């Protein structure tokens, strides 16, 4: 049956005392298909020059308060679905990690039976297995005349790890702000934003509005169904509020939010509509 | 029995070694048979700085990935010898990420190796960040007498093309400290050539994992699921170093303050070697 499935974290045997999410939690929070009913702007951008820069998770394991480790990565749906909208529209994509190490997907959440998500994933495998070093990106491919229109930070739980305290992410968010480019992020992806307020008395993103994954669900429901095998040592939305950001949501409804050029999503549910929002906004800003 | 690589379900198109290759290359116990200098250094100042791997997957020529890490035998057995002589160990990585081991080679029944793992589990799970160590804990008055780079196939990623590892190897030379590495660990020494016509380790002699074994036998028994994209011995040779072996016999070498071992078989004999050299250096004050 489909609620006799275990609520116990399954162990990941590549690592010591580290665990996948429970078969139950996977039965409620994943699915073979996503809620995607096609693209709005197939072929809209033609000139070829504009593209999206993705910053990505390269570390899979998140050490928790009980000493156990959660075996995560970026959420495939939250990465791959928005990118499908963009790529079909005619925006190319480059993939960077902090170190140039391979990108870590939460593969236990791959919608296996979705033509769009799997075909997009195939088109990105190379750039995923062999990303760019983001410091190499700042050095060359940014500046005022950069062909990056926006910087996309997908979610998953792994987005909490390196991405949250990185001077190279800070420098990238400084660039985006100072050249009116989009920052697109969703889920725990917003933990990236904590890097903007590093070595500083106040953040450049103070008074910005974002959808964030609610603390409640990480501190409460996710632990009780064995999605996470222990408590996180701090919470994305809590520290984002202490940096002077307006965390608009507190529930997981698929709500998206534009605010200046920081377009967000609250959860994995918002993947498809954050994809649609960003394509609209990007094509709008070309005028 | 099977030479077919075993799949790893953490990662797309990734594979552990084949259960046959595990039967030949891995064992529940190591040939450890005693420390040689327990309690020898008592003054508790001098420590050892390990630089470990954060990346466990190695992308290969066929597109498949190899699920590795540092070799627990090569990491832990040498650190046991040095810890029991009285040198504490501080673990660093490049981005501060958790240290990745090849847990399929962890000698489960070996008391000394397991004991050492538990003593470091905390420092292994939250290592220091190598660039912070550079900023704060190096210089001429640093309490690191050696820097230790264990092998495992994951030493090939990151470490081998890292300005932080480069600065670290510069320090050791310019401050007369030891560089102790084994197996595929010497791939770290390729960083000394980074952005330089000439490497400061030009001319040094080292033991490395033979090219022959990674190209032929490791592929045939399904240790590796595909061919490595470059070879550590070949690239090292090109930087002007002198690769002194072409086989795995457990050999070791000491060229000045650079101590190398050729394989996981040298783990014990090298640990022995590193403790003697370090104690001998301390005696060379008066």
Author numbering:
A (entry chain B): 4 to 290
B (entry chain A): 8 to 293
Question: What did the published study say regarding this structure?
Answer:
The structural studies herein confirmed SAV0551 from S. aureus Mu50 as a member of the DJ-1 superfamily and that it has all the pertinent traits of this group, including the sandwich fold and nucleophilic arm.
To secure the SAV0551 glyoxalase III reaction intermediate and to determine the difference in the histidine location between A. thaliana DJ-1 and SAV0551, SAV0551 was crystallized with the DJ-1 glyoxalase III inhibitor glyoxylate. However, the glyoxylate in the SAV0551 crystal structure is not perfectly co-ordinated, potentially because of the relatively low resolution. Still, the SAV0551 co-crystal structure shows the clear density of the glyoxylate C1 and the interaction with Glu81 and Gly159. The C2 carbon–oxygen atom (O2C2) forms a hydrogen bond with His78 (2.83 Å) and a water molecule (2.71 Å). The third oxygen atom (O3C2) is 3.35 Å from a water molecule and 3.65 Å from His191, which demonstrate weak electrostatic bonds. Additionally, in the SAV0551 co-crystal structure, excess amounts of glyoxylate are also located in the aspartate-rich regions within the adjacent cleft of two irrelevant chains, which are not dimers.
